[PDB]
Structures are given as structure tokens and as C-alpha cells.
Design a protein around this ligand. Structure first.
Ligand SMILES: *[C@@H]1O[C@H](CO)[C@@H](O[C@@H]2O[C@H](CO)[C@@H](O)[C@H](O)[C@H]2NC(C)=O)[C@H](O)[C@H]1NC(C)=O
Ligand SMILES: *[C@@H]1O[C@H](CO)[C@@H](O[C@@H]2O[C@H](CO)[C@@H](O)[C@H](O)[C@H]2NC(C)=O)[C@H](O)[C@H]1NC(C)=O
Ligand code: NAG
Ligand code: NAG
Lengths: 49, 49
């Protein structure tokens, strides 16, 4: 996926792996190493007039 | 069964009239929507990811 990775304060339960938004797309994910918790947010975008 | 309205009967006769002797200044409200929230969508960002 493409996005920005930022530090997250979400308290995952030890067994929990993903984090899903309303649209069932991975919002918060756990990296295989360091067992860290991140946020996945789409890059800056918008309309042009 | 819903009460259709308060029952009433006005005394009608062909030589009698009723004329007010006092008045009452009344204020009433009325709410009307004018414009909703302007919205816009992005085609590819929604259909695709
Ligand atoms: C003016 O007089 C008429 C009759 O004298 C009144 O009409 C009657 O009003 C009473 C009120 O309790 C009713 O019970 C009667 O049935 C009415 N008469 C008829 C024939 O229906 C009238 O109400 C009077 N005006 C006012 C403002 O009270
Ligand atoms: C018309 O109605 C008004 C209000 O319903 C009357 O004014 C009232 O008069 C009494 C006695 O003079 C006072 O105690 C109230 O405080 C008044 N009310 C208000 C809101 O000022 C008035 O008297 C009526 N008209 C007539 C000719 O009696
Ligand atoms: C891989 O990362 C884990 C998490 O810190 C660490 O304990 C381990 O030593 C690392 N192993 C290698 C080969 O880098
Ligand atoms: C009013 O109607 C009655 C019948 O209900 C009638 O007798 C009377 O003449 C009428 N009034 C007038 C002024 O004609």
C-alpha cells in the first residue's frame, strides 16, 4: 500500500494484528520487527480549480 | 382510534351576529430549509485506491 506511516497510540491487544476502518481497509498495522504499531494514511491529495 | 378533533358547534341563526370586543397579538414561528451541504467526490480515488 501507499501512504504515510506515523507513530500510533492505539493499544492493540497482544493477539491483535491489523486495524480496520469503516471501509474494512487496513488502517493500523503491526510491523514484523520491533513489534511496533503504525498508522496507514493516504498521502495528501485534493481537487484543483 | 385517533381523536379527529375537538368537537364543537356554532350557534347559527339568520338574524344574529357575533363581533369581537378585544384582540390578541400573536407571534408564530416557521422553519424552512434553504440549502444543504455542498459535496464533491473523486472518481478514481473512490473506485480505485
Ligand atoms: C349568543 O347567544 C346565543 C344564543 O342566545 C349563544 O348560543 C348558545 O350558546 C350556548 C353556550 O353554552 C350553547 O349551549 C347553545 O347551544 C347556543 N345556542 C344554540 C341555538 O346552539 C351564543 O353562545 C352567545 N354568544 C356567546 C359569545 O356566548
Ligand atoms: C383585552 O385583553 C387584554 C389581555 O387579555 C386585557 O388586558 C388585561 O386587563 C386586565 C384588567 O385591566 C389586567 O389585569 C391585565 O394585566 C391585562 N393584560 C395585559 C396583557 O395587559 C384587556 O383588558 C382586554 N380588553 C378589555 C376591553 O377588557
Ligand atoms: C530481528 O528483530 C528482532 C526485533 O528487535 C530482534 O530481536 C532480532 O535480534 C533481529 N534479528 C536480526 C537477525 O536482525
Ligand atoms: C329565519 O329562519 C326561520 C326558520 O328557521 C324563519 O321562520 C324566519 O322567518 C327566518 N328569519 C327571517 C328574518 O326571515
Amino acid at each position: 500500500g501507499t501512504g504515510v506511516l506515523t507513530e500510533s497510540n492505539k493499544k492493540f491487544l497482544p493477539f491483535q494484528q491489523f486495524g480496520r476502518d469503516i471501509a474494512d481497509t487496513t488502517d493500523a498495522v503491526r510491523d514484523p520487527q520491533t513489534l511496533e504499531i503504525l498508522d496507514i494514511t493516504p498521502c495528501s491529495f485534493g481537487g484543483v480549480s | 382510534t385517533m381523536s379527529l378533533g375537538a368537537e364543537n358547534s356554532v350557534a347559527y341563526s339568520n338574524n344574529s351576529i357575533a363581533i369581537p370586543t378585544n384582540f390578541t397579538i400573536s407571534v408564530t414561528t416557521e422553519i424552512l430549509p434553504v440549502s444543504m451541504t455542498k459535496t464533491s467526490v473523486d472518481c478514481t480515488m473512490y473506485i480505485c485506491g
